[PDB]
Amino acid sequence: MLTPGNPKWERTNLTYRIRNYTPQLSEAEVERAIKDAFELWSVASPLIFTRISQGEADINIAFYQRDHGDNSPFDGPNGILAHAFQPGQGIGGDAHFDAEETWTNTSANYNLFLVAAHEFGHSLGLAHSSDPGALMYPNYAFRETSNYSLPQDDIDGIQAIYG
Ligand SMILES: COc1ccc(-c2ccc(S(=O)(=O)N[C@@H](C(C)C)P(=O)(O)O)cc2)cc1
Ligand SMILES: [Ca+2]
Ligand SMILES: [Ca+2]
Ligand SMILES: [Zn+2]
Ligand SMILES: [Zn+2]
What we know:
Blueprint: E1 13-18, H1 27-42, E2 48-51, E3 59-64, E4 82-84, E5 95-98, H2 112-123, H3 152-162
Parallel strand pairs: 1-2, 1-3, 3-5
Antiparallel strand pairs: 4-5
Helix pairs in contact: 1-2
The structure holds the ligand COc1ccc(-c2ccc(S(=O)(=O)N[C@@H](C(C)C)P(=O)(O)O)cc2)cc1, calcium ion (2 copies) and zinc ion (ZN) (2 copies).
One zinc ion binds at residues 118, 122, 128.
């Protein structure tokens, strides 16, 4: 359940930056979803996420449409919701979300908190899990985001990489 080559961050205090926003949510809701998604991983690892408002962060978050400068283009409504890059410099660790989705912070498709939480797993070096109850399962499926907590399989995965 660990990315090929087992790449990971050489540091536990990582910065992130939301570059732009989606018309589907208020800017604050996006920040809330993002900050909460990072927290999911922080409570199960040594990772500490620090937000910056400008400049390059270790993990840049952005909403893009179709072709957006990195070859893994998005595909319009539905289908690919987002993607991220394994730990590394430059684009490594970055997380891109399809700007053509009906993003939400509720259970309706698609909850940004859950998708971001998922992608950050990749941003941290986690690969997919075959466990349907895992956040890193290959397919999205809303889960009660209320008292939602990182599934044990993902705890195992993140732990296996950073303790
Ligand atoms: C609450 O649990 C989950 C939440 C979101 C996903 C999820 C699954 C697939 C995608 S994807 O948009 O299909 N991207 C995949 C790929 C086509 C680029 P990948 O980034 O997961 O590899 C995004 C989020 C899975 C589980
Ligand atoms: Ca980066
Ligand atoms: Ca899409
Ligand atoms: Zn991209
Ligand atoms: Zn994934």
